[PDB]
Design a protein around this ligand. Structure first.
Ligand SMILES: CSc1ccccc1CC(=O)N1CCC[C@H](S(N)(=O)=O)C1
Ligand SMILES: [Zn+2]
Length: 140
């Protein structure tokens, strides 16, 4: 579990969105595994606006933050799960790092701010849904 709290937005994995998230929906995209809902309180996270390929992510199944090198946002086949059919997830970045199913939501960050959240992984991989292209998270 986990979310990004920037401005009056809450960014979560679409597959982990709550009823309250759906009832206060701003934007969602199944192909990216992302959903954004509106919040009453202002958040403290800042979004990175860069092309970094090195950063640090939080792994809840180890209670640890790990430095990682990650690929550029791309399309990558993600194996069928209880949440989506076998398919091409977009804007996804891969790294070598420990991950297990409930780690979705952990933040990946670089020197510029939050880069994205854990969405996939496996056999020593972890994948992140990028948010750096969502410029509207910084305003209104
Ligand atoms: C950290 S996820 C993980 C880790 C180790 C092993 C397996 C997984 C599960 C995983 O890859 N899933 C299941 C939840 C839905 C995502 S997604 N990206 O939204 O299609 C895909
Ligand atoms: Zn950066």
């Amino acid at each position: 579990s986990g979310a990004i709290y920037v401005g009056n937005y809450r960014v979560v994995n679409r597959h982990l969105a709550t009823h309250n998230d759906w009832a206060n929906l701003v934007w969602e995209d199944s192909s990216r595994d992302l959903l954004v809902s509106s919040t009453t309180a202002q958040g403290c996270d800042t979004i990175a606006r860069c092309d970094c390929q090195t950063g640090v992510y939080y792994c809840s199944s180890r209670r640890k933050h790990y430095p990682v090198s990650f690929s550029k946002p791309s399309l990558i086949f993600v194996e069928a799960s209880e949440y989506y059919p076998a398919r091409y997830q977009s804007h996804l970045m891969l790294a070598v790092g420990h991950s297990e199913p409930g780690d979705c939501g952990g933040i990946l960050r670089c020197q510029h701010g939050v880069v994205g959240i854990v969405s996939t992984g496996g056999n020593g991989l972890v994948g992140f849904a990028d948010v750096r292209d969502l410029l509207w998270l910084d305003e209104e």
